[model samples]
Target: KVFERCELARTLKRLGMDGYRGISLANWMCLAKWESGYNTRATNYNAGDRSTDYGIFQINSRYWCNDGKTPGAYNACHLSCSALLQDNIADAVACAKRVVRDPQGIRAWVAWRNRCQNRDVRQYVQGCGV
Candidate 1:
C-alpha cells in the first residue's frame, strides 16, 4: 500500500519480467502485507546503530544507502522514506516466484509457501528453495 507502484513496475519492465502476472502480483502483495503492510512509514529499531529503519517496504536505511546495488541508484521516486527502497515490486515479486518454483521445479507458489512455513525444520536444503 505504501510502496510506490510506478517504481516497482518500472523496475520489472527493465528486468524484462512480467510485472502484472498473477505470480508477480501474489508475491508482491504477500510480502507487502507480511513484512511492511504496505506502509512506507514503517520502521524498525536497531539498538546497535541507534537508528530507526524506515520506508514503505521496511528497508533498513543505514544498510541500503551506501550500496549502489539497491534502489538508491533509482532515486526511489516511488518511495518517500528510507534508504533501502524497494521500488522494484515486480522484480521482487519475480524473485519470490523464482524462489518458490525452484523447489517444486514448477510454477507453483503454494508449494513454496508450504516449504517456507516449515523453514524452522529446514524443509528445503538443496537448490530448491533459497
Candidate 2:
C-alpha cells in the first residue's frame, strides 16, 4: 500500500521496528522512497540474471524469495515472492528482519547504501516522532 512518510514511519514503529536494530527509520524511509516509491506492487525484472525484485522494499528472488519460475532459487524467506506485493506488509517485514541479520545489515539494500548511507535523512521522519 502507498503510505505517506509519517504514516509509514508510525506503522513501522508500531510494528516494533523503530529502527536501532541494524536499521534506522530515516534510512528505511529513504530506502522505501527510492526503491519503490512506497508502491507495494512494484516489481522489476532483470533480464541479465532473470531475477526479480518485489514489493516496496524490492526484496529480490536472488536470495530472499522463491518465485518458483526461477531455477535453483534459494528461498531464504521460505515464501512466495508474490506474497510481498500484498497491501499487508507483515510477511515482508518478517523477511526484512531476516535480511538485516545478514552480514551486510542494512547495506543489503542498495538504495539505502547509495542514497541514505551517511546522509542526515532525518527529514524522512520529521513529523512522525519516530
Candidate 3:
C-alpha cells in the first residue's frame, strides 16, 4: 500500500495520466484508504493459501506479471510491489488514470459513497475547472 496507495492521485497527476480535470485529491485519498486500509501488504486470502495478491493497488500479482497463463499468471513473472514496490506507485496511478479517462472516476466515487459509505458528498465545487 505504501507504493501504490500512499500518494496515488498526486503521483498520477505527475505522470501525466490525470484524466479528470477537476477531481479532488482528497477524493482519491479516501478511496485508497477505504480500499486497502493503507496497507500494501493487505490481501484477500482465498481457499488456496498458495495464491496471494500483493501491493497497495491490490493488483492481482498474476494479472500484470504472472506466467501461469491463467488468471494469476502475472504473479510469477511480474515485478510486484514487494519487488522494491518501486514502480507500484506508478502502476496505481496509471490504473487510476485509465479509470478516470473513461466516464467513471468521479461518477464511480459517488456510487461508491452512496452504496458503500452511505454518504452524499462532493469533493469540490461545481464550475471549478481544473
Candidate 4:
C-alpha cells in the first residue's frame, strides 16, 4: 500500500511514533518519505553484501530479519522478512524500535542520516496534528 503523506503521519502517531527514543514523528515521516515513498511492499537489494531491505521502512535482512539467504543474520527482530512486507505496520514498528534500542540506533537506516538528519524535518508533521 502507498500511503498519502498525512495518512501515514496519523498512522505512525497511533502506533506511538510521536517521540520514540527521542526521534520525532517528523523524523520518522522524513525517513519514510525518502526511504520507500510510503509503499508497504518496497524492497531494495544490496548486491554488494547480498542483503536485502524489506517493506515500508526498509529494514535489512542481514541482522534484523532472516531471509535465509543472508550470510550473517541475527534475526534481531525475530521474524521473517516476509512479514515485514505486509501492509500492517505493527511488526515493522516493533522492529524499527528495536533498531533504536542500542547505541547504533536510527542511523541504522543510513538514508535517515543522509536525507533526514539536521534538516527541516518538523515540516513533515506540520499539518498532520501528530
For all candidates, the clash counts are 5, 0, 13, 0
Report lDDT per candidate.
0.40, 0.85, 0.46, 0.90
Q: Model 1 misses residue 42 by how many Å?
A: 1.3
- Model 1 lDDT on a 0 to 1 scale: 0.40
Q: Any runs in candidate 3 off by more than 4 Å, and if so which?
A: 1-21, 45-54, 59-88, 106-111, 114-130
Per residue, candidate 4 scores C-alpha lDDT tens digits across 18-62 of 889988899999998998999989999999999999988999999
- Model 2 per-residue lDDT tens digits across residues 1-130: 7877888888777776667565877787888889998888999998888889999899999889999776677999989998989988778888888899888888998888899999988889997877
TM-score of 2: 0.94
Provide the RMSD of all predictions against the true structure, rounded to 1 decimal: 11.3, 1.1, 6.5, 0.9
C-alpha RMSD between model 4 and the true structure: 0.9
Candidate structures ordered by TM-score, highest first:
4, 2, 3, 1
* TM-score, prediction 4: 0.96
Clashing pairs in 4: none
Q: Which ten residues in a row have the lowest lDDT in candidate 3?
A: 121-130
Clashing pairs in 2: none
